[PDB]
């Protein structure tokens, strides 16, 4: 199998500025017809992949002029001359010379904006859910940038581990921010034997961590 490697894997770009994605193949990709089958695919959020570049350098027919490509037989570059918000998504290289065809791991292009700290909210479980024997406590981190954030749950000052799950939205195509939910799941019995529930948030935009809490 051909190993395809991309770099970088995460690529924040200031809106309007150029961006470059690298792909490397473990074998030269010249096929028996004298062409090099290195394709670039763009996968925008929630969409099927679409081919942007084929054979290293050739733009597909419906592709804006800002996309271009070059490369040797083993080292390839996809260039975006000026990144638009509509270019946010995952870009994959694929070698189409030796089946099984193989893809790079993908490079996620996002818009680089100014640092924005999250607004933090905490939600106790509803009375309706408690009746059914489970407690979900939800911590919301809203409209922040960059994507890296840390959420620590504390129950009566005890740090929790293993009983929470996080989810993060796709970058917002208007303000370039992310939002994140952290959900702590306890049995109703465990929830009712504690008092203070708190989520502690650390982020580049905060000088000190912020804690949102409620008392049962």
């Amino acid at each position: 199998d051909i190993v395809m490697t991309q770099s970088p894997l995460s690529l924040p770009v200031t809106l309007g500025q150029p961006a470059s994605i690298s792909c490397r193949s473990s074998r030269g990709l010249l096929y028996i017809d004298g062409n090099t089958y290195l394709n670039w695919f763009q996968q925008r959020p929630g969409q099927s992949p679409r081919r942007l570049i084929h054979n290293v350098s050739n733009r597909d027919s419906g592709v804006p002029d800002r996309f271009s490509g070059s490369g040797s037989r083993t080292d390839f570059t996809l260039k975006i001359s000026r990144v638009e918000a509509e270019d946010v998504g995952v870009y994959y290289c694929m070698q189409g010379t030796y089946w099984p065809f193989t893809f790079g791991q993908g490079t996620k292009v996002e818009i680089k904006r100014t640092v924005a700290a999250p607004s933090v909210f905490i939600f106790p479980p509803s009375d309706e859910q408690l009746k059914s024997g489970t407690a979900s406590v939800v911590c919301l981190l809203n409209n922040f940038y960059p994507r890296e954030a840390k959420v620590q749950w504390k129950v009566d000052n005890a740090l929790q581990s293993g009983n929470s799950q996080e989810s993060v939205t796709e970058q917002d195509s208007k303000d370039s921010t992310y939002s994140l939910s952290s959900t702590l799941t306890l049995s109703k019995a465990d929830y009712e034997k504690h008092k203070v529930y708190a989520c502690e948030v650390t982020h580049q935009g905060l000088s000190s961590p912020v804690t949102k809490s409620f008392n049962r």
Binding site: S48, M94, T97, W99, N142, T169
Partner: protein, 215 residues
């Protein structure tokens, strides 16, 4: 324009077999082949195999050679991929893509179908429980919990409220059931004066639930 249209979503217990289809239009189907690619949750793209609609030749990645059978029907311009002995890690969106007719060229992959979501799990189809996330700027929401399979759609006030809405990607719980929240940020001064209802539609179970979210 070239268009590839794939069959609808499948929900299967592990060990089942399925047949997915991909109907071509806008070009001579039999002058080309079809490649199949999948994408598992949170992962990249994985090439599965290829069939020529011209000469019926096939090739597949080694991990699929034993469980996958590709066929075409030139009379309907449709390609089919049979997948036997489904495993939970076959959960993925499956794509067809127009590809080379034979080995005189390398890969094309120039037009892709819309994808077919295939979910494989021992869980049974089940609509969600919907719980309120009760509230200068306040946040409120709905917890959409314990449903299977993906997807659910959430609107607020029947679509009238879109500004500030975030519906999170689902997470798979250790129960094998999915869960997500949908949240919206609103002015604190609107909480005692206005109505907030989340509309949760779960097409796989044909269930819909509206939930009033109160302070």
């Amino acid at each position: 324009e070239v268009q590839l249209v794939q069959s609808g979503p499948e929900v299967k217990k592990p060990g089942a077999s399925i047949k997915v289809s991909c109907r071509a239009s806008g070009y001579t189907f039999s002058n080309y082949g079809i490649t199949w690619v999948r994408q598992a949750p949170g992962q990249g793209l994985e090439w599965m195999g290829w069939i020529s609609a011209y000469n019926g030749h096939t090739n597949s990645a080694q991990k699929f050679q034993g469980r996958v059978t590709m066929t075409t029907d030139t009379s309907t311009s449709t390609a089919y991929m049979e997948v036997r002995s489904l495993r939970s890690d076959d959960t993925a969106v499956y794509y067809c893509a127009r590809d080379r007719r034979d080995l005189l060229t390398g890969s094309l992959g120039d037009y892709w179908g819309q994808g077919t979501l295939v979910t494989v799990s021992s869980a049974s189809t089940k609509g969600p429980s919907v719980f309120p996330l009760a509230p200068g700027t306040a946040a409120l929401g709905c917890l959409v919990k314990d449903y299977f399979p993906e997807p659910v759609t959430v609107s607020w006030n029947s679509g009238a409220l879109t500004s500030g809405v975030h519906t999170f990607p689902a997470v798979l719980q250790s129960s094998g059931l999915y869960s997500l929240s949908s949240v919206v940020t609103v002015p604190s001064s609107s909480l005692g004066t206005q109505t907030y209802i989340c509309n949760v539609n779960h097409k796989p179970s044909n269930t819909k639930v509206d939930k009033r979210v109160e302070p």
